[PDB]
Design a protein around this ligand. Structure first.
Ligand SMILES: [Fe+2]
Ligand SMILES: [Fe+2]
Ligand SMILES: [Fe+2]
Ligand SMILES: [Fe+2]
Lengths: 282, 282
């Protein structure tokens, strides 16, 4: 163990991402969530239940990435500066997870929040995606860990992120949406950075293993995608939104792939996102 | 793995410390370090060398706590909220380590900084304290890890922290001192919190083991203390400050012990700190 030296950077990307993530620091207390109480009251009981179920699912994934995901990447870091960036990523995942509790406390009845947590424990597609990602994090293959991480950061959140963006486009839960945009601002850099590191590590490996990994990445994404369609159907069943969410999934699946340096899987016909959703995202 | 719930806190202390540490977030870029350039020029070559050697030693310890220390406590957490607090502690240790590079870049010549890093790699007392703490972090005894951590956070930094506080009392390197005060503001809470958790865990163990641990804590502190006197002699040899630093060590050793719930080891005669140092600390 040696004292880290930030004036001897071996990969400029490490410093760029360190700077981006740390200068994007936020806490849920900085968002005036309580201003969403009136809009919350205008939602139907079905819409309110959907929101709490969505948010507990996102909490699980952030908790996973904090406790297991980002720490699992640490032994595989190329530089000590990357190790430090990973410590920031792990901490900001805890901030993400915590922020869902801030929303629940501000807007929701505890009996309903507890029901949503229980629903998430029993939800098959949610538990399946958590299981699949965990298996790779706990595995011995550092490159498969990074693929799974990018799929978590750049794809697996987005069936959930869709909803506050939709509400935002309707002028509802705009403060919650501002908070979610802060989470997304982090996740997008996380997926980009880990994807970048995947590609850097791939430079060292054989032509055969590169092909095995590309095939693995596509098969895994297809499996997570199929599972995510089921998760979406079970969440969004009493709404007319399932098709919109699905297109949003395809759109973000293509971004996850590009972060790993791969071509899009889903054609434009499947990844067409309503301009109001895109606008709310910005 | 379950989604964390911050509205079901099992120990209020976890939320208190989460809030304290996150609301104390800072980065070295927030401190106008470049305003210290004039004062830096007024220091002697011997004083400048001392400063760089001191700071590399502190960098090593922060790096240790980031990479090994705080993560080593995670498996022993009593609550999921403590796990999250530990993620923040680990990240802020990386910020601490990074900030020494910010100082070096702003104030120092690279040839001199590199010499100081090399000196730290070869310094026997510095490598010994790093070794002793690491051994406990890598051990199987969760309670001894916490003792070692509190000694790192509340004692082992302070032979180094003395110097910028001294300069500050003389109206020199006041911005660097402001930065160091931010580091200390974190370390003091870290030592308090981990010490609190040590005591919480001690509630569960036998009367015999409590006595074995108290004896171990005192013996370890005495060993680190003896080593730290040697480290101090080797750092401060060409100055008249060694006695002042030593008293500061005794003062902080007593605080480390109180964080673990133990009585002071060092009498007032040994722990008398010059009022100007104390004032600079506030
Ligand atoms: Fe997250
Ligand atoms: Fe993330
Ligand atoms: Fe530190
Ligand atoms: Fe610390």
């Amino acid at each position: 163990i040696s004292a880290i030296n930030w004036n001897k950077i071996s990969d400029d990307k490490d410093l760029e991402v360190w700077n981006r993530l740390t200068s994007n620091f936020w806490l849920p207390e900085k968002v005036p969530l309580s201003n969403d109480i009136p809009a919350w009251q205008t939602l139907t009981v079905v819409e309110q239940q959907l929101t709490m179920r969505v948010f507990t699912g996102l909490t699980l994934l952030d908790t996973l990435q904090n406790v297991i995901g980002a720490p699992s990447l640490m032994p595989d870091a190329l530089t000590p500066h990357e190790e430090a960036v990973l410590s920031n990523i792990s901490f900001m995942e805890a901030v993400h997870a915590r922020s869902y509790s801030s929303i629940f406390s501000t807007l929701c009845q505890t009996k309903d929040v507890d029901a949503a947590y229980a629903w998430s424990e029993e939800n098959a597609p949610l538990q399946r995606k958590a299981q699949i990602i965990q298996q790779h994090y706990r595995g011995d293959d550092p490159l498969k860990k990074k693929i799974a991480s990018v799929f978590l950061e750049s794809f697996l959140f987005y069936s959930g992120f869709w909803l506050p963006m939709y509400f935002s486009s309707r002028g509802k839960l705009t403060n919650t949406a501002d908070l979610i945009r802060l989470i997304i601002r982090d996740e997008a850099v996380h997926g980009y950075y880990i994807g970048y590191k995947y590609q850097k590590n791939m430079e060292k490996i054989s032509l055969g293993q590169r092909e095995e990994l590309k095939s693995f990445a596509f098969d895994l994404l297809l499996e997570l995608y199929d599972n995510e369609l089921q998760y979406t159907d079970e969440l969004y069943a009493e709404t007319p939104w399932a098709d919109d969410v699905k297109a949003f999934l395809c759109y973000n699946a293509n971004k996850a792939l590009m972060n790993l340096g791969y071509e899009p899987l889903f054609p434009a016909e499947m990844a067409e996102v309503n301009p109001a959703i895109l606008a709310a995202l910005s």
